[PDB]
Amino acid sequence: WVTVYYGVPVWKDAETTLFCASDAKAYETEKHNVWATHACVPTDPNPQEIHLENVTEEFNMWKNNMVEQMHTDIISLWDQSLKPCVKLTPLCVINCNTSAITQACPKVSFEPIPIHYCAPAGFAILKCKDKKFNGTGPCPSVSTVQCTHGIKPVVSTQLLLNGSLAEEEVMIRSENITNNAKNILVQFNTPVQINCTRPNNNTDIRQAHCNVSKATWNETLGKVVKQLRKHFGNNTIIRFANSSGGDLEVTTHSFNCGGEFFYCNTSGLFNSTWISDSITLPCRIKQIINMWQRIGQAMYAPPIQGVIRCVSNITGLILTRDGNSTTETFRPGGGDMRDNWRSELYKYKVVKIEPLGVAPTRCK
Amino acid sequence: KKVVLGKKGDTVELTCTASQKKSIQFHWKNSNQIKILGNQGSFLTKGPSKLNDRADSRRSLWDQGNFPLIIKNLKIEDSDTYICEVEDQKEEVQLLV
Amino acid sequence: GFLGAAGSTMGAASMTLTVQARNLEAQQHLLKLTVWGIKQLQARVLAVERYLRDQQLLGIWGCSGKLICCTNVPWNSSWSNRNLSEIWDNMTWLQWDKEISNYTQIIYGLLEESQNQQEKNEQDL
Amino acid sequence: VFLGFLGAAGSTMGAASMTLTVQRAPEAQQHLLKLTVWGIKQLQARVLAVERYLRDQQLLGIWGCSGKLICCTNVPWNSSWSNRNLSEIWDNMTWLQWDKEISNYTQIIYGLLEESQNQQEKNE
Amino acid sequence: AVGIGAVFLGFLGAAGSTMGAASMTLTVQARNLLSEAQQHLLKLTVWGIKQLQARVLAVERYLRDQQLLGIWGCSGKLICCTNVPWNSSWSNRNLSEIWDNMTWLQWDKEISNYTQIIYGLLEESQNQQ
Ligand SMILES: *[C@@H]1O[C@H](CO)[C@@H](O[C@@H]2O[C@H](CO)[C@@H](O[C@@H]3O[C@H](CO)[C@@H](O)[C@H](O[C@H]4O[C@H](CO)[C@@H](O)[C@H](O)[C@@H]4O[C@H]4O[C@H](CO)[C@@H](O)[C@H](O)[C@@H]4O)[C@@H]3O)[C@H](O)[C@H]2NC(C)=O)[C@H](O)[C@H]1NC(C)=O
Ligand SMILES: *[C@@H]1O[C@H](CO)[C@@H](O)[C@H](O)[C@H]1NC(C)=O
Ligand SMILES: *[C@@H]1O[C@H](CO)[C@@H](O)[C@H](O)[C@H]1NC(C)=O
Ligand SMILES: *[C@@H]1O[C@H](CO)[C@@H](O)[C@H](O)[C@H]1NC(C)=O
Ligand SMILES: *[C@@H]1O[C@H](CO)[C@@H](O)[C@H](O)[C@H]1NC(C)=O
Ligand SMILES: *[C@@H]1O[C@H](CO)[C@@H](O)[C@H](O)[C@H]1NC(C)=O
Ligand SMILES: *[C@@H]1O[C@H](CO)[C@@H](O)[C@H](O)[C@H]1NC(C)=O
Ligand SMILES: *[C@@H]1O[C@H](CO)[C@@H](O)[C@H](O)[C@H]1NC(C)=O
Numbered sequence: 001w002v003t004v005y006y007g008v009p010v011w012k013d014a015e016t017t018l019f020c021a022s023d024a025k026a027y028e029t030e031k032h033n034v035w036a037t038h039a040c041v042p043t044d045p046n047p048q049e050i051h052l053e054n055v056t057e058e059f060n061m062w063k064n065n066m067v068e069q070m071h072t073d074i075i076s077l078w079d080q081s082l083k084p085c086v087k088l089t090p091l092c093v094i095n096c097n098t099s100a101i102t103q104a105c106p107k108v109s110f111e112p113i114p115i116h117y118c119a120p121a122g123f124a125i126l127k128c129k130d131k132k133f134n135g136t137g138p139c140p141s142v143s144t145v146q147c148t149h150g151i152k153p154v155v156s157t158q159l160l161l162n163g164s165l166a167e168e169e170v171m172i173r174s175e176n177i178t179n180n181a182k183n184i185l186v187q188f189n190t191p192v193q194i195n196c197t198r199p200n201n202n203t204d205i206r207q208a209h210c211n212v213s214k215a216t217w218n219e220t221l222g223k224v225v226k227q228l229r230k231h232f233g234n235n236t237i238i239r240f241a242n243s244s245g246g247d248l249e250v251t252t253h254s255f256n257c258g259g260e261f262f263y264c265n266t267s268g269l270f271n272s273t274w275i276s277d278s279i280t281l282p283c284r285i286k287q288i289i290n291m292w293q294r295i296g297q298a299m300y301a302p303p304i305q306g307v308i309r310c311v312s313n314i315t316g317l318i319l320t321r322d323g324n325s326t327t328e329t330f331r332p333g334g335g336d337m338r339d340n341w342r343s344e345l346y347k348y349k350v351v352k353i354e355p356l357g358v359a360p361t362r363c364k
Numbered sequence: 365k366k367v368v369l370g371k372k373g374d375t376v377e378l379t380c381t382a383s384q385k386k387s388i389q390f391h392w393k394n395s396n397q398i399k400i401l402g403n404q405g406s407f408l409t410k411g412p413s414k415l416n417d418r419a420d421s422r423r424s425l426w427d428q429g430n431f432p433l434i435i436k437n438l439k440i441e442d443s444d445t446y447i448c449e450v451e452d453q454k455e456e457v458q459l460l461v
Numbered sequence: 462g463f464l465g466a467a468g469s470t471m472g473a474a475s476m477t478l479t480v481q482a483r484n485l486e487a488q489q490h491l492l493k494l495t496v497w498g499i500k501q502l503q504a505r506v507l508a509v510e511r512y513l514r515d516q517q518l519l520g521i522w523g524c525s526g527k528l529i530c531c532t533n534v535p536w537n538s539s540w541s542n543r544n545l546s547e548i549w550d551n552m553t554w555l556q557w558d559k560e561i562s563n564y565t566q567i568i569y570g571l572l573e574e575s576q577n578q579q580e581k582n583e584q585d586l
Numbered sequence: 587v588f589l590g591f592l593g594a595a596g597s598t599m600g601a602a603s604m605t606l607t608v609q610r611a612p613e614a615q616q617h618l619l620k621l622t623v624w625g626i627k628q629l630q631a632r633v634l635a636v637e638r639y640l641r642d643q644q645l646l647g648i649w650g651c652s653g654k655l656i657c658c659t660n661v662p663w664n665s666s667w668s669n670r671n672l673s674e675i676w677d678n679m680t681w682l683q684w685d686k687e688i689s690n691y692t693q694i695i696y697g698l699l700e701e702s703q704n705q706q707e708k709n710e
Numbered sequence: 711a712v713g714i715g716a717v718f719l720g721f722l723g724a725a726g727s728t729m730g731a732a733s734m735t736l737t738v739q740a741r742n743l744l745s746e747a748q749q750h751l752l753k754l755t756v757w758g759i760k761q762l763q764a765r766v767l768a769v770e771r772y773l774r775d776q777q778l779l780g781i782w783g784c785s786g787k788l789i790c791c792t793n794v795p796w797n798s799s800w801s802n803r804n805l806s807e808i809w810d811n812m813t814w815l816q817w818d819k820e821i822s823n824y825t826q827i828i829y830g831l832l833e834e835s836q837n838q839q
């Protein structure tokens with residue numbers, strides 16, 4: 001004999017279509033700041049973060065639905081912003097016809113602005129207000145909020161640029177560690193700085209150098225090797241390494257600095273086997289690139305004349321292991337762009353509140 | 365277990381097939397669990413194996429679900445079985461020189 | 462609009478389940494307040510229309526208006542028959558909601574018919 | 587409660603009573619003004635659609651059967667109110683054709699149907 | 711507040727009338743009482759929101775009474791009778807002294823010392839039953 005109720009604090013975990021909310025400007029012609037006026041509402045003027053009292057909820061990071069909601073829109077952002085001159089998407093029907101295409105392609109400006117992902121009517125967003133949350137499992141102090149923090153859609157491989165940093169020690173999160181097929185998203189507790197300048201001597205045009213401090217990088221990776229021995233043994237001799245190979249976009253730390261796609265060289269950045277000045281990254285502006293939005297190459301205009309620079313805040317390390325014993329080889333990875341934003345949407349979850357239960361009391 | 369016979373130095377196509385046809389992440393390992401290939405989004409990523417300069421895949425077929433591995437310069441010490449992990453279905457394929 | 466209060470105990474919910482309704486200049490950004498004035502008001506008409514569309518279900522099962530209603534559909538054994546003591550003692554309403562997965566869809570299907578059987582019972586006397 | 591809620595006016599009233607219970611740059615810097623202004627039009631239509639539901643739950647409450655979809659009452663039919671054979675007006679007739687028939691007496695049915703609850707309020 | 715704001719004013723129509731003649735017309739009245747330029751459009755919308763931040767307030771103030779009537783048994787009924795016995799300790803007056811020579815306002819000056827106790831007795835009487 002069941003008893004229907006209509007007051008229960010019961011929420012499901014549902015999936016819906018969120019709406020963006022960015023701090024736009026509506027006069028600037030920066031190509032992010034012209035999309036953010038077109039498909040984003042402004043920032044919520046009165047934001048409210050109610051802290052739930054004593055509820056613990058089993059989150060999950062790798063099966064989130066915001067990080068495939070986010071991936072639909074930065075695919076839709078890099079189709080209005082950076083229109084290449086020649087684009088070859090492999091349409092197929094071995095008989096795959098490399099369908100060329102052409103359009104206008106002027107040089108534009110490009111910088112990531114923070115974008116909040118809000119929740120529609122009837123849904124909530126449950127923040128994981130903790131410090132040691134390893135991505136999967138019960139968050140203890142789950143608050144609630146309507147919109148996420150300022151997340152900037154910076155697309156890069158091998159190094160999560162410009163992202164937020166952990167207030168506690170260096171976090172290490174993978175979907176299944178000791179799988180040797182899943183990336184290991186390290187997240188920094190301090191912002192390692194990196195300059196990336198194209199010089200002004202007009203002789204090469206497409207050649208740049210990137211300076212990272214030797215004091216900060218040997219100390220920050222000195223923190224990472226300690227907590228990597230937490231999920232591993234205590235006396236493992238881990239070996240950092242160069243990236244293995246593949247395409248240029250994942251062998252080398254690639255990004256886009258003001259409209260020109262840099263391709264750096266982090267072989268001197270992972271060159272140490274761990275036990276118990278300024279590094280110079282030889283970069284190169286490329287012009288025939290692969291695309292991360294889909295399969296297919298794309299060609300752009302030559303770079304602009306003046307000095308090109310962007311000082312940054314590497315706050316992430318998408319490493320990758322390989323399975324021989326008593327050691328570990330940790331070469332860098334990244335490239336699947338969903339890992340570039342689930343490093344920043346890990347403490348969020350969209351739910352909906354369903355207030356109708358049928359408890360046992362066995363009445364009549 | 366499927367077995368594919370390639371003689372010497374040629375190119376084989378150790379096929380592997382998905383269902384939903386949307387280029388999900390796969391990999392290719394061996395008996396000691398060492399990575400041969402790897403999909404990363406829309407790019408490709410090798411691993412520290414013996415086929416480091418010998419492995420490649422047909423990129424245009426990933427959108428249809430077929431995720432093959434094509435090894436060139438087939439030497440003698442590549443005889444093993446290979447593990448293609450599409451979603452969970454580790455479809456093993458063995459190779460003989 | 463009828464939300465919850467923190468969960469955190471099944472038995473202490475049913476005491477406080479009643480009391481949630483038993484007693485009770487900018488001029489510069491006129492798009493930051495007008496867009497978010499609708500989105501904070503579209504979420505107050507939905508909290509009214511979800512109440513009226515859920516008093517419509519309890520109107521079908523004869524439970525319209527009553528918060529804690531009692532009905533004549535017996536427990537099958539195949540709906541995760543746990544201990545009836547410790548359900549109310551140390552459990553949250555979230556944890557009980559996981560304890561039935563797909564039986565909620567077939568619990569509701571009997572209550573639509575048991576009232577229609579009771580519709581064919583009260584008019585057959 | 588909605589306004590585009592029943593656009594399922596089919597043919598069989600017996601089937602209609604069955605489904606009676608089961609229920610990119612166009613901007614030019616003005617696309618935040620199109621979605622704000624017509625956001626109000628979708629809110630002045632939904633709120634009035636609520637207050638039509640509450641205006642009718644008081645009218646079904648005077649007839650005693652409030653909060654319920656199919657209201658069965660205790661007053662019989664007549665001969666003036668299109669005395670058909672309960673087959674031509676229940677299996678092959680749309681509701682719009684049925685509403686057009688008894689429209690002369692809908693204001694006359696509602697008077698006595700109020701009185702049939704007041705008699706059931708006398709035995710209390 | 712044009713929808714259900716004019717209903718609350720219509721409740722006070724027969725104030726000061728006697729208690730029998732005011733309760734007799736509850737059923738009668740409730741059926742009858744429930745019956746752009748450039749600079750303009752970013753100000754004429756706040757005149758459309760503020761006229762809906764009070765019209766919705768007339769809805770969720772009216773439904774906070776039917777959620778209260780529904781706890782005490784009858785929901786949707788205006789005149790409704792309950793299985794709870796009237797203690798004479800509330801007021802020691804016969805019914806001849808009540809529905810003939812009193813107005814509804816004098817009850818708030820008579821039973822509001824006890825009017826939170828009656829609301830608890832009306833709760834359990836339609837809870838266990
Ligand atoms: C991480 O976050 C930081 C913080 O935002 C990012 O660093 C910023 O990066 C942008 C671009 O990389 C940079 O913006 C430039 O600032 C210069 C002044 O500081 C501007 O002069 C410059 O404008 C010119 O360059 C644009 C490039 O497309 C042109 O489109 C634009 O019209 C301007 O062009 C004029 O000048 C050039 C010569 O430079 C000439 O050829 C043209 O004809 C024209 O005359 C940019 O706006 C910010 O200054 C950086 N911020 C800081 C603090 O340094 C960083 O990019 C983020 N990381 C990643 C990976 O994105
Ligand atoms: C926290 O949990 C304890 C468990 O004993 C409970 O008694 C307490 O009420 C909870 N805190 C709050 C604020 O509800
Ligand atoms: C993680 O990977 C290891 C190695 O294959 C495996 O044994 C383990 O079952 C995996 N974890 C899960 C939850 O599948
Ligand atoms: C980078 O470092 C080298 C050596 O320290 C120095 O010569 C060069 O000028 C630096 N470049 C920038 C842009 O700081
Ligand atoms: C980067 O450049 C800025 C200014 O050019 C300088 O203040 C900062 O110290 C540099 N950082 C590194 C790590 O070289
Ligand atoms: C600097 O790097 C070396 C290895 O390259 C390491 O052994 C040393 O401990 C580092 N310095 C500090 C202060 O940690
Ligand atoms: C980086 O990779 C290239 C080719 O894969 C290799 O020649 C080079 O030695 C690597 N760098 C280091 C430091 O191993
Ligand atoms: C740069 O990359 C080449 C191969 O791409 C590698 O051989 C070399 O060691 C790298 N050098 C640095 C300083 O990263």
Ligand SMILES: *[C@@H]1O[C@H](CO)[C@@H](O)[C@H](O)[C@H]1NC(C)=O
Binds near residue numbers: 268271
């Ligand atoms: C990088 O590694 C090579 C060989 O692995 C070594 O010769 C070189 O000194 C290293 N450079 C630094 C800065 O440690």
Ligand SMILES: *[C@@H]1O[C@H](CO)[C@@H](O)[C@H](O)[C@H]1NC(C)=O
Binds near residue numbers: 191
């Ligand atoms: C990098 O991080 C530091 C935090 O200490 C911040 O002050 C600085 O503005 C950041 N630089 C950016 C976002 O370009």
Ligand SMILES: *[C@@H]1O[C@H](CO)[C@@H](O)[C@H](O)[C@H]1NC(C)=O
Binds near residue numbers: 595597598
């Ligand atoms: C429409 O009419 C056809 C033919 O009479 C019938 O088969 C069909 O069920 C009807 N559909 C609806 C939705 O009324």
